[PDB]
Amino acid sequence: MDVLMTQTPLSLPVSLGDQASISCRSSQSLLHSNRNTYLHWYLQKPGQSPKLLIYKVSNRFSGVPDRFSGSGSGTDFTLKINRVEAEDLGVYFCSQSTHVPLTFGAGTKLELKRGSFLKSWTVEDLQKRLLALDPMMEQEIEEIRQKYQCKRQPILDAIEAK
Amino acid sequence: MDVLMTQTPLSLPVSLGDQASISCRSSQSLLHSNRNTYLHWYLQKPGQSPKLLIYKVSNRFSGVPDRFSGSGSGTDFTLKINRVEAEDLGVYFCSQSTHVPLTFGAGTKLELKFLKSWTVEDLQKRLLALDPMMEQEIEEIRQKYQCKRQPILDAIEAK
Amino acid sequence: EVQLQQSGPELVKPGASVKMSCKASGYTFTSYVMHWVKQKPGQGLEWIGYINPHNDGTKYNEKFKGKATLTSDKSSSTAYMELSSLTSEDSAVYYCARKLRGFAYWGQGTLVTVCSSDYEFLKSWTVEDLQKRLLALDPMMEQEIEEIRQKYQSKRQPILDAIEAK
Amino acid sequence: EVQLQQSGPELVKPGASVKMSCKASGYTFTSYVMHWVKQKPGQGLEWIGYINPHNDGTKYNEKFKGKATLTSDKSSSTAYMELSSLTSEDSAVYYCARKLRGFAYWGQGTLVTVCSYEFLKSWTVEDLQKRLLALDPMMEQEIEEIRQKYQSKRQPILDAIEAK
Numbered sequence: 075m076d077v078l079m080t081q082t083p084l085s086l087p088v089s090l091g092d093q094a095s096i097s098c099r100s101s102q103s104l105l106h107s108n109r110n111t112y113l114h115w116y117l118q119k120p121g122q123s124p125k126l127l128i129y130k131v132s133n134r135f136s137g138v139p140d141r142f143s144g145s146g147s148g149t150d151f152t153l154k155i156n157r158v159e160a161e162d163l164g165v166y167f168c169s170q171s172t173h174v175p176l177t178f179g180a181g182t183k184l185e186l187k188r189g190s191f192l193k194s195w196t197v198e199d200l201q202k203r204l205l206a207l208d209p210m211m212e213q214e215i216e217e218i219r220q221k222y223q224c225k226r227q228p229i230l231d232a233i234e235a236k
Numbered sequence: 237m238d239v240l241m242t243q244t245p246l247s248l249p250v251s252l253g254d255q256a257s258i259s260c261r262s263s264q265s266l267l268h269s270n271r272n273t274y275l276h277w278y279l280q281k282p283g284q285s286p287k288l289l290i291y292k293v294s295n296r297f298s299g300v301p302d303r304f305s306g307s308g309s310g311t312d313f314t315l316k317i318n319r320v321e322a323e324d325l326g327v328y329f330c331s332q333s334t335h336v337p338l339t340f341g342a343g344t345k346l347e348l349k350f351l352k353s354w355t356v357e358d359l360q361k362r363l364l365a366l367d368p369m370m371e372q373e374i375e376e377i378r379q380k381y382q383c384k385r386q387p388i389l390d391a392i393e394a395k
Numbered sequence: 396e397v398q399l400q401q402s403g404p405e406l407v408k409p410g411a412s413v414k415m416s417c418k419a420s421g422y423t424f425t426s427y428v429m430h431w432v433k434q435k436p437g438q439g440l441e442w443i444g445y446i447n448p449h450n451d452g453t454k455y456n457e458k459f460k461g462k463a464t465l466t467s468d469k470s471s472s473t474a475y476m477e478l479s480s481l482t483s484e485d486s487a488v489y490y491c492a493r494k495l496r497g498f499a500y501w502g503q504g505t506l507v508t509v510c511s512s513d514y515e516f517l518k519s520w521t522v523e524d525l526q527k528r529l530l531a532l533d534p535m536m537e538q539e540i541e542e543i544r545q546k547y548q549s550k551r552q553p554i555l556d557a558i559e560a561k
Numbered sequence: 562e563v564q565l566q567q568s569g570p571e572l573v574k575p576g577a578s579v580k581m582s583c584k585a586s587g588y589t590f591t592s593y594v595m596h597w598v599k600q601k602p603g604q605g606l607e608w609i610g611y612i613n614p615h616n617d618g619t620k621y622n623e624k625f626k627g628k629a630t631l632t633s634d635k636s637s638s639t640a641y642m643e644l645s646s647l648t649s650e651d652s653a654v655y656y657c658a659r660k661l662r663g664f665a666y667w668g669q670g671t672l673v674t675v676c677s678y679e680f681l682k683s684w685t686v687e688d689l690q691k692r693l694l695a696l697d698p699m700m701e702q703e704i705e706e707i708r709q710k711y712q713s714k715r716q717p718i719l720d721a722i723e724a725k
Contacts, residue, residue, distance in 0.1 A: 075524040076623075078531060084542045087549075101531070114663040123656065123667040124606070135665065167606055169663075175622040176596075178606040187549075192721045200722050204715060211711045215704055216570070216672065217602075222700045223572050224676035226693060232681035233689045237688030240695055246706045263695065276497040285490065285501040286440075297496065329439070331497065337456045338430075342439035351557040359561075363554045370547040374540055375404070379508045381536040382406050387513035388529040392522060457680040482575070483649040484677060511650050516623040 077102050079168055081179035087187040094155040096182045098168035103148040105172070112171040115144055115153050118181075119164040121209030127166075128153065158184070160195070160203050239264045239332055241341035249349035252358070256317035258344040260330035265310045267334070274333040277306055277315050280343070281326040283368030289328075290315065320346070322358040325365070397421040399491050399502035407481050407509050415505040417474040417491030424472040425449040427493045431465065431476050434504075435487045445494070446474055481509050563587040565657055565668035573647050573675055581671045583640040583657035590638035591615040593659045597631065597642050600670070601653040611660070612640060647675050 078101035088094050104111050113131045118124035126135045128144035131151060141156040155162055163186065168179040192200075240263035250256055266273045277290040288297045290306040293313060303318040317324060329343040351359065400418045407413050417429065431443040444455040446465040453465045462485075464477045474491055486509045492498035517525070568582040583595065597609040610621035612631040619631045628651075630643040640657055652675045658664040681689065 075520060075528060078528075080535075080538075082538075084538060085545070116664070123669060124664065125667070126663045126665050129663040133662075135663070169606075171663075174620070175624075176608040178608065180605045190717075192717060193724070195721065197722060197725060200718050204718055207711060207714060211707065214707050218700060218703045218707065220570060220572065220672065220674045222696055224674065225696055227572070227574075227676060228678045228681060229689055229693050229696075232678075232684065233686065233693070236682070236686050236689070237684045237692065240692065242695070242699065244702070246702055263691070278497075285503060286498070287501075288497045288499050291496040295496070297499065333497075336454075337458075338442040340440040340442070351553055354557065356558060356561050359554050359557050363551060363558070366547055366550055370543060373543045375506065377536060377539050377543065379404060379406060379506065381532055383508060383510035384532055385529065386406075386408075386510055387517050388525050388532075390514050391517040391520060392525050392529070394518065395522060457683060460680070512648070513624075516626065519623075 076175050077104075077170055077173045077177050079170060079177050079179040081166075081168060081182045083182060084180065085183045085185065087185055088158050089187060089189075090159060090191070091157050094158050094162075094184060096153045096166050096184075098146075098151045098153070098179050100149050100151075100170055102173065104151075104170050105148055110172075111147065113144075113146070113151050114169045114171070115142075116167045116169065117162070117164050118167065119161075119206060119209070121211075121213035122164075124167065155184075160199055161206065163206075237263075238337050239266070239335045239339050241330055241332060241339050243328075243330065243341040243344050245344060247345045247347060249347055250320050251349055252322055252354070253319050256320050256324075256346055258315045258317075258328050258346070260308075260313045260315070260341050262311045262313075262332060264335060266332050267310055272334075273309065275306075275308070275313050276331045276333070278329050278331060278340075279324070279326055280329070281365060281368070283370075283372040284326075286329075317346070322354070322361050325362075397493070397500050399493065399500055401489075401491060401502035401505045404506040404508065407485075407507060409482055409509050409511075410480050412477055412479050413481065413507060414475055414477040415489060415507075417476075417502050419472045419474070419493070422493075424467075425469060427495060429467065429474040430492050430494055430498065431463070431474075432490045432492060432498075433459075433487045434490070443476070443489075448474065478507070481507070483509050485509055563659070563666045565659060565666055567655075567657060567668035567671045570672045570674065573673060574677065575648060575675055576646050578643060578645045579647065579673055580641055580643040581655060581673075583642075583668050585638050585640070585659070588659075590633075591635060593661060595631075595633065595640040596658050596660050596664065597629065597640075598656045598658060598664075599653045600656065609642070609655075614640065644673070647673070649675050651675055 080099045082097040086094060086096065104113050106112060111131050115128040116124040117127055127138050127142055128134055131146055132144045134142060143154050145152050153166060163184050165181045165183050167181050170177055242261045244259040248256055266275050268274060273293050275293045278286040279289055280286040289300050289304055291297055293308055294306050296304060305316045307314050313330060315328060325346055325348060327343040327345055330341040332339055398420050402416045405413050425448045428445045428447045430445040433441045433443055442456050443459045443463050444453060444465055446453050446467045448467040448469060451467060462479060466475045478485055486507060488504040488506055490504050491502040493500040564586050566584040571579045573579050591614045594611050594613045596611040599607040599609055608622050609625045609629050610619060610631055612619045612633050614633040614635060628644060633640045644651060652673055654670040654672050656670045657668045659666040
């Protein structure tokens with residue numbers, strides 16, 4: 075039977091600078107017989123592809139900020155963020171490859187309770203955040219474009235057949 | 237070809253007290269040969285049933301407050317809200333029954349674009365409007381898990 | 396009081412039939428034509444058709460000719476809709492509504508959810524594996540519902556604050 | 562630079578099949594196993610399966626035997642996935658991703674939209690064409706609302722930048 079991965083919480087509101095902690099429980103232990111624990115963490119920003127953050131419980135992938143740390147053992151694992159920043163917002167998924175089939179958690183959305191201390195952001199972070207909204211707008215517009223594609227099809231089909 | 241009903245704008249931010257205007261346009265004149273024009277306006281709060289506001293272009297249905305007014309002719313109609321209240325937030329749509337089949341417009345969202353300037357009545361109305369919104373989403377979850385339960389039950393009952 | 400009381404939500408495997416009811420009270424059932432309307436969330440309302448209980452005559456939107464059958468019963472003061480051979484596209488809220496100047500009166504809506512295909516691979520599981528998983532859905536459902544509950548507590552709180560120390 | 566370049570959006574009627582492509586560049590295609598993941602909009606990741614291009618070996622999540630078929634072509638450095646007899650439950654973004662210590666490199670994802678006619682045969686040809694044209698301003702209205710929603714969100718950030 076596939077291994078169930080439960081993430082807690084499902085939605086986690088914070089303010090920039092806060093500590094965030096995200097938990098993941100597997101219905102069966104992730105300790106392999108060859109003694110590795112194949113637990114991984116991903117962050118997927120809205121409208122973007124997921125990116126790998128941690129592999130094997132606690133190893134940060136080459137390039138991942140120091141504020142991310144992973145821990146745990148067997149069935150219980152935590153991801154921790156020290157001082158959340160705006161580019162950390164998004165959907166965190168846990169995954170296991172100790173067992174076949176490979177499985178994912180349902181996801182934990184990290185979002186703002188009610189946001190802004192905006193003038194205290196650096197120029198970089200401000201413009202980085204604008205860039206972060208652009209794929210959020212592209213996904214939503216793409217959705218309308220493909221919706222109207224479907225609305226056109228039966229009408230174009232009827233035209234050709236008349 | 238049934239009559240297409242299009243509305244402008246799709247979303248309208250307001251604060252309680254402004255004028256709201258919602259436009260409704262038809263692909264075909266709604267003036268009937270019997271010289272009546274069967275265009276109606278409705279309000280649907282999210283998670284609730286629609287309620288009739290205006291019939292025959294400019295007749296307020298009995299019970300609808302007087303700040304609501306509708307006008308127009310042929311293919312073009314306007315609904316006007318004179319000094320918006322809190323109980324008016326929600327979705328407005330037009331409907332036509334001149335031509336068979338009856339068709340509806342898809343709706344304009346009258347939304348809220350500060351709570352201390354409101355009265356306790358208004359805040360209570362607004363608080364209560366959240367209940368059918370929450371039960372809508374919760375029942376959606378409950379039915380999703382029903383569908384999720386079926387395949388396992390079907391396999392268990394097949395042994 | 397006039398009330399249109401519709402039957403509860405339905406869960407249908409595709410290709411099946413479903414019949415819902417619209418129980419009228421508070422007026423002469425035969426004196427008014429009963430209409431039916433479809434609303435997929437975030438889509439506009441579509442008119443399905445009507446039944447005239449005074450003479451059992453019907454009309455159908457050509458778009459739903461073949462999909463819906465309207466019936467009525469005087470002694471029960473009840474209108475019915477049967478939807479045939481449901482696909483996923485039939486997942487929607489269905490209202491009954493009484494008409495005169497417009498639809499002054501609306502039922503509360505019947506929600507029809509068309510399910511999926513999973514049994515295919517699930518027949519190979521052990522009964523314990525199955526019964527353990529069937530139970531694991533209840534904690535998964537409660538966690539999702541509690542997300543909804545918290546989302547709305549968030550929307551209530553600024554309003555509740557304004558009311559408290561009003 | 563490693564790039565997993567996936568094919569464009571797909572518009573399918575129910576019951577059809579679609580075959581999508583994942584062209585890898587910037588690394589030795591045959592040195593790495595290619596995985597595929599399904600993501601319905603607003604929901605979780607589901608693992609479909611993998612193909613090993615070095616020997617064409619494949620593994621499938623049971624939830625996708627028969628639904629998905631994985632192949633590859635060494636000469637083109639391209640992985641393919643074919644989905645058969647589509648339903649509305651199959652409308653989702655489909656990702657390919659290269660695995661070593663995990664999913665380090667991801668394609669941008671292929672979006673599959675499963676759409677729905679009869680009664681339109683009652684319409685005239687000019688009535689069909691007029692309705693087709695009435696769709697264009699209706700789309701623009703929806704898109705313009707999305708644009709303004711995002712304009713509203715950007716302006717305080719743009720203001721903070723202007724006032725530096």
